[PDB]
């Protein structure tokens, strides 16, 4: 899509500036809390061998990308639903409606939601998503893949999230604002303008992960 | 058999949440509480 | 039925004692694993709008109570068959050498068996039946009915089984031993002497299901 192309251009620009190889670094000056994301992946479980990948968004909504390339979402109200087929038709329903064609997929989603809620931590719990608007269109997981070091999550709103396994650091890239939110080992969230990181520099930790993010975004475009 | 579609029956195999949670614990997932 | 009358008296005696309204409930003192049932229904398929009700017993034998009030049972050897006519008359045969008049009912039973083996979980797979060394004669399903909350199954040996839809709990009532086996939502199987539940009490969950059981046995008797 055009959003991944923009993200790649922003990452190319910031990496080309070598932001960590600076005589002086003023990473704080690149912060811009106005770009804090409204949606990110807080939980996930890889059941790809049988059913697919379920995940939780920061608004406690739940979704699953089944192995048949269809998607089902359960909003935070606990009843309304959204089912995206392979072709991409957004259909809206509810659990109370008891749809017969989606009864199995509903049951599986509920199981994903159960395990995540009772076994997994909520990433970004210490952060209030942007906007008093809880009316923002819920995004879905367009695609995802896993390396030996991280899981890459591409949401339908253009956001790309990269969770690093070993140290639990996380990147949330927003191409619409050329911004990135970084979650460090201590779970402190910082949001930056990529363009300002070019101009003020940043630590090797963030710089090296933006280098990795660029190669991941290239992978998303090659597919 | 093709037209053998019972409308009601006992719990189906896919609806075994105990095996589901078992597999999730064995599969890769996000970070759990320490 | 002599057995249903015994079960009704057994259940009235325990229920009249209000087993959950005790200072100290000691349900565990009523457990008697020596009363574990030999046979219980482990799967069922309600196709009564066309053919009838098919079911599997815990020994992997299967049966069908057809809409014409006849029953066909396939023993776990996969070949031996027992046919019970409307008036109760029993005859024995095999899929290999059968009367041609039963060929359609045999075919239907195979469909039921295949559907249960391919699609349905086996209830009580963890629990091990009391063993007569297969000497115990295979019961057949005498009658059944479904309510808002459960399916009730009356076997020819006198036992009554109640499967509650909501929480997957089940009661197996054995009038011959004045005992009841309860499978909780954790799929944990416990067998109790009703007389000892009366004396030592029981939790509210089981007590309420034993009241429900009495209502269902009255219903079986009224028909």
UniProtKB/Swiss-Prot annotation, chains A, C:
Modified residues (Phosphothreonine): 128
One GO-annotated biological process of the protein: protein phosphorylation
A GO molecular function held by the record: protein kinase binding
Up-regulation conditions: By growth-stimulating agents.
Location of the region described as Important for interaction with phosphorylated proteins in the Swiss-Prot/TrEMBL record: 168-170
Tissue expression summary: Placenta and colon.
Post-translational modification: Ubiquitinated by the anaphase promoting complex/cyclosome (APC/C) in anaphase and following DNA damage, leading to its degradation by the proteasome. Ubiquitination is mediated via its interaction with FZR1/CDH1. Ubiquitination and subsequent degradation prevents entry into mitosis and is essential to maintain an efficient G2 DNA damage checkpoint.
Record's keyword terms, sorted: Acetylation, ATP-binding, Cell cycle, Cell division, Centromere, Chromosome, Cytoplasm, Cytoskeleton, Isopeptide bond, Kinase, Kinetochore, Mitosis, Nucleotide-binding, Nucleus, Phosphoprotein, Repeat, Serine/threonine-protein kinase, Transferase, Ubl conjugation
Region (Linker): 123-137
Crosslink position(s): Glycyl lysine isopeptide (Lys-Gly) (interchain with G-Cter in ubiquitin): 122
Compartments (UniProt record): Nucleus; Chromosome, Centromere, Kinetochore; Cytoplasm, Cytoskeleton, Microtubule organizing center, Centrosome; Cytoplasm, Cytoskeleton, Spindle
Annotated positions of the Phosphoserine modification: 5, 80
GO cellular component: centriolar satellite; centriole; centrosome; chromatin; cytoplasm; cytosol; kinetochore; microtubule cytoskeleton
Effect of residue 168 to A: In pincer mutant; loss of centrosomal location and decreased interaction with phosphorylated CDC25C and BUB1
Domain POLO box: 40-118, 140-222
Domain of life: Eukaryota
Quaternary structure note: Interacts with CEP170. Interacts with EVI5. Interacts with FAM29A. Interacts with SLX4/BTBD12. Interacts with TTDN1. Interacts (via POLO-box domain) with the phosphorylated form of BUB1, CDC25C and CENPU. Interacts with KIF2A. Interacts with CYLD. Part of an astrin (SPAG5)-kinastrin (SKAP) complex containing KNSTRN, SPAG5, PLK1, DYNLL1 and SGO2. Interacts with BIRC6/bruce. Interacts with CDK1-phosphorylated FRY; this interaction occurs in mitotic cells, but not in interphase cells. FRY interaction facilitates AURKA-mediated PLK1 phosphorylation.
Family (UniProt): Belongs to the protein kinase superfamily. Ser/Thr protein kinase family. CDC5/Polo subfamily.
Function text: Serine/threonine-protein kinase that performs several important functions throughout M phase of the cell cycle, including the regulation of centrosome maturation and spindle assembly, the removal of cohesins from chromosome arms, the inactivation of anaphase-promoting complex/cyclosome (APC/C) inhibitors, and the regulation of mitotic exit and cytokinesis. Polo-like kinase proteins act by binding and phosphorylating proteins that are already phosphorylated on a specific motif recognized by the POLO box domains.
Record-given protein name: Serine/threonine-protein kinase PLK1
Organism: Homo sapiens
Full-protein residues shown: 371 to 593 of 603
Swiss-Prot record, chain B:
Quaternary structure annotation from Swiss-Prot or TrEMBL: Component of the CENPA-NAC complex, at least composed of CENPA, CENPC, CENPH, CENPM, CENPN, CENPT and CENPU. The CENPA-NAC complex interacts with the CENPA-CAD complex, composed of CENPI, CENPK, CENPL, CENPO, CENPP, CENPQ, CENPR and CENPS. Interacts with MLF1. Interacts with PLK1.
Modified how: Phosphorylated by PLK1 at Thr-11, creating a self-tethering site that specifically interacts with the polo-box domain of PLK1.
Species the sequence originates in: Homo sapiens (Human)
Mutagenesis / variant outcome for changing residue 11 to D: Failed to enhance the PLK1-dependent degradation
UniProt similarity note: Belongs to the CENP-U/AME1 family.
Protein name: Centromere protein U
Stated role: Component of the CENPA-NAC (nucleosome-associated) complex, a complex that plays a central role in assembly of kinetochore proteins, mitotic progression and chromosome segregation. The CENPA-NAC complex recruits the CENPA-CAD (nucleosome distal) complex and may be involved in incorporation of newly synthesized CENPA into centromeres. Plays an important role in the correct PLK1 localization to the mitotic kinetochores. A scaffold protein responsible for the initial recruitment and maintenance of the kinetochore PLK1 population until its degradation. Involved in transcriptional repression.
Post-translational modification Phosphothreonine, affected residues: 11, 31
Tissue specificity field: Expressed at high levels in the testis, fetal liver, thymus, bone marrow and at lower levels in the lymph nodes, placenta, colon and spleen. Present in all cell lines examined, including B-cells, T-cells, epithelial cells and fibroblast cells. Expressed at high levels in glioblastoma cell lines.
Effect on the protein upon substituting residue 10 to A: Insensitive to PLK1-induced degradation
Subcellular location: Cytoplasm; Nucleus; Chromosome, Centromere, Kinetochore
């Amino acid at each position: 899509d055009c959003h991944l192309s923009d993200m790649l251009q922003q990452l190319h620009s910031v990496n080309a500036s070598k932001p960590s190889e600076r005589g002086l670094v003023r990473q704080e000056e690149a912060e811009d809390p106005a770009c804090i994301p409204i949606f990110w992946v807080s939980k996930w479980v890889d059941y790809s061998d049988k059913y697919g990948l379920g995940y939780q968004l920061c608004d406690n909504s739940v979704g699953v990308l089944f192995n048949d390339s269809t998607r089902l979402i359960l909003y935070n109200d606990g009843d309304s639903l959204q089912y995206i087929e392979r072709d991409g038709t957004e259909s809206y329903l509810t659990v109370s409606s008891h749809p017969n064609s989606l009864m199995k997929k509903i049951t599986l989603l509920k199981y994903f939601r159960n395990y995540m809620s009772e076994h997994l931590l909520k990433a970004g719990a210490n952060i209030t998503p942007r906007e008093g608007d809880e009316l923002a269109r819920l995004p879905y997981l367009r695609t995802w893949f896993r390396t030996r070091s991280a899981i890459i999550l591409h949401l339908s709103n253009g956001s790309v999230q990269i969770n690093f396994f070993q140290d639990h650091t996380k990147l949330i890239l927003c191409p619409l604002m050329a911004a990135v939110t970084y979650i460090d080992e201590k779970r402190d969230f910082r949001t930056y303008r990529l363009s300002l990181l070019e101009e003020y520099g940043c630590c090797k930790e963030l710089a090296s992960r933006l280098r990795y993010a660029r190669t991941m975004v290239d992978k998303l475009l090659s597919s | 058999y093709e037209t053998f579609d019972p409308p009601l029956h006992s719990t189906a195999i896919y609806a075994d949440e105990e095996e589901f949670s078992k597999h999730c614990g064995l599969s890769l997932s996000s970070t759990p509480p320490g």
